[PDB]
Amino acid sequence: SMTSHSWLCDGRLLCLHDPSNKNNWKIFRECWKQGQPVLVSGVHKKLKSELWKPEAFSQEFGDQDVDLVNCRNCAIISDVKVRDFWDGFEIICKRLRSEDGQPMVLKLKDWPPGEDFRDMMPTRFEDLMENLPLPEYTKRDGRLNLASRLPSYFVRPDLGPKMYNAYGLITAEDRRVGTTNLHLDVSDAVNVMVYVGIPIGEGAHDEEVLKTIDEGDADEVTKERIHDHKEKPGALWHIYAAKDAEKIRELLRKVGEEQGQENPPDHDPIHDQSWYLDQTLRKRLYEEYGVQGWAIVQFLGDAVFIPAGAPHQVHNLYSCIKVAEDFVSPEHVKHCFRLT
Numbered sequence: 001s002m003t004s005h006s007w008l009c010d011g012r013l014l015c016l017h018d019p020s021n022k023n024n025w026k027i028f029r030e031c032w033k034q035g036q037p038v039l040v041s042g043v044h045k046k047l048k049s050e051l052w053k054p055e056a057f058s059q060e061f062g063d064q065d066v067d068l069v070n071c072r073n074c075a076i077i078s079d080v081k082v083r084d085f086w087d088g089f090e091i092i093c094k095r096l097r098s099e100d101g102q103p104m105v106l107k108l109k110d111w112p113p114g115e116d117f118r119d120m121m122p123t124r125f126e127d128l129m130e131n132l133p134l135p136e137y138t139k140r141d142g143r144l145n146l147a148s149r150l151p152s153y154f155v156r157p158d159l160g161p162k163m164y165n166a167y168g169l170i171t172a173e174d175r176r177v178g179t180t181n182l183h184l185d186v187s188d189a190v191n192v193m194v195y196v197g198i199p200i201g202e203g204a205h206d207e208e209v210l211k212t213i214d215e216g217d218a219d220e221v222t223k224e225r226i227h228d229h230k231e232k233p234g235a236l237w238h239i240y241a242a243k244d245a246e247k248i249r250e251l252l253r254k255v256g257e258e259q260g261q262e263n264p265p266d267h268d269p270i271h272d273q274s275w276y277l278d279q280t281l282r283k284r285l286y287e288e289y290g291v292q293g294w295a296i297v298q299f300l301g302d303a304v305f306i307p308a309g310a311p312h313q314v315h316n317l318y319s320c321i322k323v324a325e326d327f328v329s330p331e332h333v334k335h336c337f338r339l340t
């Protein structure tokens with residue numbers, strides 16, 4: 001039977017099932033006020049699927065100049081054409097190679113650049129903004145989005161949305177690497193998975209994806225979404241409550257010191273965006289500091305709601321296109337205030 005919602009993370013994560021249900025706010029606001037993330041499934045069914053394909057981005061925009069990041073070692077690949085990224089998205093024999101001769105796991109940096117999404121892609125902008133869930137929170141002029149209503153005493157988010165494009169991590173060694181490292185945002189965000197590319201040429205890499213989800217601490221109901229419904233998993237997230245951010249900084253200062261980094265006692269390892277919490281670090285956070293997080297698998301069409309101030313990291317299982325919009329909910333406006 002169709003149902004309004006369900007629970008993941010053993011009851012700790014709300015999953016809303018109908019992205020356009022006008023009564024979603026009633027279930028949402030109780031979880032959101034407690035500083036929890038929220039998942040909304042089914043957004044892909046509301047979109048024009050032909051606007052979100054890697055081959056269309058390559059054909060329409062392929063001649064623009066961009067920088068890429070090598071996810072395995074953080075090396076920057078400077079001033080290449082954006083088609084050099086898109087044409088290797090799903091076909092592995094077309095990817096740029098490292099010196100070792102392996103195909104690289106790449107992230108497309110800052111594209112479209114700054115606030116240019118709306119100017120470059122007006123039809124994509126319309127399709128996304130008209131179909132975001134919880135529209136009183138997430139639309140630029142929603143009644144519960146304070147972004148446009150705040151004085152300079154508050155840090156205001158840039159004009160969005162922002163696109164996040166990267167290949168899937170592949171090997172056993174890749175399990176310890178992030179697509180996006182641990183960081184926090186002073187605004188709320190909604191992050192939508194609009195396309196998942198399961199490759200060909202090394203298509204059989206499906207069993208290391210299961211070990212990554214399992215070792216990632218994913219709950220038994222999330223594991224059922226693969227085996228039972230054959231949905232496409234895009235990315236493994238870890239999110240932590242805003243209230244736990246200082247204890248995470250204490251762990252990362254102690255590990256930095258153990259690894260012979262030489263850091264002043266006050267430096268901020270979350271702001272640095274230099275760490276990915278692997279299975280060893282996540283267990284140490286729990287055992288030594290008493291901190292539990294949320295392990296979330298984002299499938300095609302899932303919208304992840306990330307609370308302001310919540311530390312979070314992202315690990316792509318397959319090649320992903322994500323589109324995110326920042327907003328300022330009244331529940332979390334304290335996180336962007338410039339005093340006390």
Ligand SMILES: O=C(C1CC1)N1CCN(C(=O)[C@H]2CCCO2)CC1
Binds near residue numbers: 309335337340
């Ligand atoms: O006590 C709180 C509230 C959450 C409980 N905060 C202190 C830290 N904080 C900041 O430093 C601002 C300075 C400009 C942007 O972030 C904001 C949040």
Ligand SMILES: [Cl-]
Binds near residue numbers: 035242331
């Ligand atoms: Cl909060």
Ligand SMILES: [Cl-]
Binds near residue numbers: 121124
């Ligand atoms: Cl467009």
Ligand SMILES: [Cl-]
Binds near residue numbers: 134135136137
């Ligand atoms: Cl709403």
Ligand SMILES: [Cl-]
Binds near residue numbers: 179180181273
């Ligand atoms: Cl990063």
Ligand SMILES: [Mn+2]
Binds near residue numbers: 183184185312
């Ligand atoms: Mn973020």
